[PDB]
Every structure is written in structure tokens, then in C-alpha cells.
Amino acid sequence: ATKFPKFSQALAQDPATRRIWYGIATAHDLEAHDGMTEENLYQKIFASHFGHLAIIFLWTSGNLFHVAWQGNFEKWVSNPLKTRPIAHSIWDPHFGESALKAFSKGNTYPVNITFSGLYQWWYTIGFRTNQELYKGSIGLLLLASVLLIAGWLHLQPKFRPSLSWFKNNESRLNHHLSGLLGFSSLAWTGHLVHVAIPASRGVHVGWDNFLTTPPHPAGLTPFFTGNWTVYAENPDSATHVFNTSEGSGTAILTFLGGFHPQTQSLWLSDMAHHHLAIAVVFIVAGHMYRTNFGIGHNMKEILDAHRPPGGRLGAGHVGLFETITNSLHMQLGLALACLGVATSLTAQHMYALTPYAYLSKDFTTEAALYTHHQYIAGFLMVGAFAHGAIFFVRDYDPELNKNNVLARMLEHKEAIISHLSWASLFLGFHTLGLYIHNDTVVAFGQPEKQILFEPLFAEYIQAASGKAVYQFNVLLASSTSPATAAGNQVWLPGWLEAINNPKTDLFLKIGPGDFLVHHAIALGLHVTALILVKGALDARGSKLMPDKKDFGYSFPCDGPGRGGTCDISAWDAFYLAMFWMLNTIGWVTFYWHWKHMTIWGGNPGQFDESSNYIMGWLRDYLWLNSSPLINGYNPFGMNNLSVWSWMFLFGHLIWATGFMFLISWRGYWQELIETLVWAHERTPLANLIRWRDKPVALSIVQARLVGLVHFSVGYILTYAAFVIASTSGKF
Amino acid sequence: MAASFLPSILVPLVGLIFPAFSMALFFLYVQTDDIA
């Protein structure tokens, strides 16, 4: 605690370069720091959370500022389909004259084109001018200052909350449900009705005039008289030109369903009504728990009451309240799991149910958004399981959870792991076998011998939602069904128009290639889960290392004895599962991208036929679409895709460099560094200078982490360059 | 003075001066024998 890191005496006394590395890697593990108390832990976390929120708001304010200052948002608004939205200007002294010209196409100065979808979103929510964006940027900058002030203040002695405040479950949940979610949703509905909908109807409503410009000619009289249908009368017509008054209606709340005919995105009235109903649901939900007013539930009583009388769950949920409350790692695991599900749902629903005007026409932005959110979802899921394993090592008390569901998971971990292994092996064997059989028969020029299972169950689901192509007369595809007669009253016409429209992504047409790729995706999910679940469930111990909990979540190994124990810790399960998460998300995004590239290229049949064997993927997806990317620069010149070509090679290099850390291990490097130390000590004029931290090879765990980071960064950068360059250089 | 000059002014400050001083400060902090 006298040297860096001051939070660890053990590290501060290490005389090697290790002291530095580990300090950096342990700075945010506040529970392990010397002299930490629980109360101080919660307070420091609270302040760090304020800092993180400040960072987020600074990032958003910066996006707004750079678009306002250097973007073409007004030109894009005037002409969405023929403008490429600008992210920010380039100033790079290393550029040549050719590079400046190449990056200034369609403009007077070099720019990067944004693929984040910010222009479409800001356009949809009512932004029209650079001044409005600049005002948003200023507001967020000031809000970031306010958050920094709050973080500083809640660390002052008179303003540090107590542990009881941090452990008040019912009140925090009530406020986050009713206020953070329900009232925020209500306020967003208010924005949509006052600002965004009028903007879509060619009417300016801003801070200058919103108090005297009612969002509906009938005012609030219908709301207070219960005659609410007035707010649904007269929606925008099918000929409504977005951003203009031609064809516009006056409905502010609707349940039209489907898409606006010109933007091919959700109706703004539909989204406003969605957020209003959401606001009601969440405000109601936020009144469930008892805070200060006698009424409401106590969570502990709820948990303790749910034990099946038969006993097949043992003690039931008794003990879980204290376990969750006292374990930040279990809380974080639950948060990361739900966030991962929500991020995947974001990716899946944004591409199909386009929420922002003209977004479905910005192909590169669509691909970038889907890939971005799916990779983030993968990271969040891996994190959820890592923190579950950490909870098992550090926070789980067997006596507090005696015979409850959490303990019974540990009691049948062998059955769980063995069955997950069987499922993984079955999926791998048969999916790889079918792909290989198809590859072989196609190689021998006999494609009619392929095994091509029709995804009948999914096609039936599509039909049930109204898709007519598959000839299933079930539910919403059936004229006489009760579901159809009921749904035709509200949303079914617009939904049926969208779903049976092949120009939309609403339930894309599927076939055997979709079947095989989906089983591959299931393989990835099951194997990633198997690694993570086995790591969590064996985190406390196994036959090979029965006392593993005494050694912590992360430790190199237990030595070469007992047959060898490399990669035995739960951290090592996280490390192994990162590879499988990356591979799985890669399969997912490859599938999404190839199907969309063939759709956008006007030839879905190419995917439909070539996706049934691996060579089709290698040749018709990767090889064929590499072309504009690899020609971003060449012996004849360069274009604006040269940055993506360079990033593509950069990613390949980083990935391969990660291989070095992953394959070669510590002893070799330590022996080499010994000769390096000898050389420096014996070299005149250089031995005038000496290190103050003894050079050592990176540690076993550190090398695993460094290899994993290099692998992951290379993977991400390579694929991002490919997806952006291929989509943007083709279309 | 104009805002259009800011990149050529600010970029060398952000990408050269700031990392150098930050790295020097962190080096000095990690080499300090008594920090508290």
C-alpha cells in the first residue's frame, strides 16, 4: 500500500513488472482490496456508477455535436435516400492527396460515413436542424457535469448512503419500475405526441411554441371524458408523404400494425400508443412492494412461501432472499443475463420490425446494427455466467441455502452437465454430418442426393402469424379462424400487408439452409452454455480438485500432479467459453449477413441453394464478397474503403498475434527474458540505465487473458471491416 | 480565429501531447515508492 497499487500490499511488494500488470487488472475488484468494508464497497460502487453514466452522456453529447458541427444532417433530412450521412470530419496529417480526395467524395472535405443509424433515429424522433442537435449536445454535456458532481458529493462523509439504504430492495424496485421505466415511458409518449408526430406531419413544435400548439385539435377533453377513441380517428393515409402535410392525419394513438407505406417503418402513432400502454403497465408494476405506507408485498415472504408441497424442489426458495441481497455477484449475473436477452431481442426485432424511417434502405447500417448488438449480447451472456461462477466461489453459503433450488442444482450438477454434453454431441455430430454429406454429394456433381430438411415447424409458426407462402391454413393464415376474426378488428390488416410483403424483413422466407444453420446456432448455444455451466457448477470443486473454492475464482492451475491440472479454474471456463461465444455469434451474424446480401442483391436463390454445404459459404459468401474490401487499395490506387482494407488486415494480424500468447506458454519466455537481462547488465553505455521493476514473463493467467483479448479484438475488427466494406462497396 | 482551425490545433494535442504527458505521469506514479 506504499507503492502502486495501494489497494494490495501483496502486489505492491512484488519486485517484478508483474506488480504493474496485476495492479491494473485488479483495480475494479473492490471486494478483494485491502481493508475494504461492505459499506465502503457499496459507496465506491455508487460513485463509480455516477462516473460511468457521465461517460455515457459525454459520448452521446459528442455524437450530437460532431453531427451538428461536421455532418450533413440537414441535407440528409431534405433527401434521405440519396445522401450518405456523415459521422465526423477527418484530419490526418499522414494522408496523401489521393486519400484526401478519396475520402471527400460527395463532399468538400474528408469524412467518415456513419453506420450507427443515428440520422434515421434522430429524424424519426423529430430532429430537423443542426441547431436542435447542438442544443441536445449542450444539454447532455451539462448533465454529464451534474452526474460527476453527484458522484463526488455522494462520497462526502455527510452524503455517503448507509448499507441499509443500498439493501432496501422494495423501495429501489418500486422506483425503478414505476419511475425509471413507467414514468420515463410516459414522458417518451409525451415527446412523441407533442414533437415527433407533428414533425412527421410537416409541423414544427419546439421549445419556442410547444405550450401553445396542442398535439391534437380536440385537446385533452377526450382524455378526461373517457371518450378516448377520438385520439385514434383519422390516421395518416396510405399516401402520406413523411415530413410533409400531404396525406397526413391527426390520430396520435393508433393500433394500425405493419409499416408506414413510404418509410417502411413503424407508425409513430403506433409507437406512441405502445409507450403509453407500457407506461401504464410499469407504473402499475411499481406499486407491488411495501416501502413506507403499510401496503404492498415483502419479497422475502414471497420467496419463502413458494415451496411445492410435494417436495420435488426440496426447501423451495427459502434462503434465496438473503443470498441475492448479500451477493453483488449474483445480482450482477442476473442483470447481465437479462441484458443479454434484451440485447439479442433488440437485434432480432430491429431488423424485422423497422422502427426508424428509411432505416431498411441503409443496408450497411442494418448489417452493422445487427452485428453490433448480437456481439454485445454474447459478451453480456458470457459475463452473466462468469459472475454466476464468481458468486459460487465467493458468495454462496451452503448452510444458508440448505436444500433449496440453488443447492439442488449443485446436487445434480453431474446429470445437468452430462445431458448438456449429450445434446451438444448430438447436435455437432448430426449438423456437421449433414453439411459434410451435402458437400460431398455436390462435389461429385450430384446435388439431388443432398439431405435438405424443410424447416417445417418454423414455417408453421410464420403461417400462424399470417404468412401465406407455405400453404398452411392455420390461425392468422386462415380466413375462418377465430384468431383472424378477432385480429381483423385492430391490427391484422396492416400486419397482414407487411408479413405477406416480400420487400420487408417481417418473417423472411426460409428453407433447408435456414434449418441447417439454425441447428448450427443451437450447437453453438449449447456448447457455450455447457462450458459456462460446468465452470459455474464446478467452481467450488471437483473430483480432480475437491478444495477448489480455497484457491479462488481465478488461479493458473494446481500443478502437474494428479495427471496435470492446466485450465482447472472457473475463470478458465470463462476463457474457453469466450472462444465458443465468438464462434457462435460469428455463425449467427454470417447467417444474417449472407441471407440479407442475397436478398439485397436480388437473388435469394443463391443463398437458398448454396447455404446447404460449407463450400457454398466459403465461396459464395466470404470469397465472393471479399472483393471490394480487398481492392480498397491496390497497385492502381485507393478509394474510401481503403481504411476498411487496412482494418481487415489489422484484425487478421491481431488475431494471429493472440495465437502466440494462447499456444506458447510461460517457461519458454521466462528463460528468454533471463538472457535479455544478462545482455542488458553486460552491455556498456546501456548498463548506465537500469530497470526498477525486474523484467519477468507474463503470468499464466495473464497470458491467457492477453491471448484472449488479442483474439477477440482481431475477430471483431476483421468482421466489422468485412461487413461494412462488403455491404457498402456492393450497394 | 475560427472553429474550422480546431482540428489542426486540437488533434496534435489529443493524440501526441496528452498521451505523452499521461504516460509520463503514470510512469512517475508507478515508480513512486511512497504514494500514501
Binding site: 465506491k44 460513485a47 463509480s48 455516477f50 462516473g51 457521465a54 459525454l58 455535436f65 451538428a68 458541427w69 443542426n130 441547431q131 447542438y134 449536445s137 449542450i138 454535456l141 451539462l142 454529464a144 457535469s145 460527476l148 458532481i149 458522484g151 463526488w152 462520497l155 | 480565429m1 475560427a2 472553429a3 480546431l6
Partner: peptide, 30 residues
């Protein structure tokens, strides 16, 4: 377009945010 004055205003606000960030960082350090 964004004026020079508006850019300078944004930069002043950024400077404020930066000094508050340094303050919070040093406080969390303790």
C-alpha cells in the same frame, strides 16, 4: 450552421466537465 461562438461554448462546458471528472476521480481514489 454551428457558429464559432457555439463551438467555444461547448468547449467551455467540456472544460467544466473535465475538472469535475478529475475531482471525482481523485475522490474515488481516496
Amino acid at each position: 450552421m454551428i457558429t464559432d461562438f457555439q463551438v467555444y461554448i461547448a468547449l467551455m462546458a467540456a472544460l467544466l466537465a473535465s475538472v469535475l471528472a478529475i475531482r471525482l476521480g481523485a475522490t474515488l481514489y481516496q
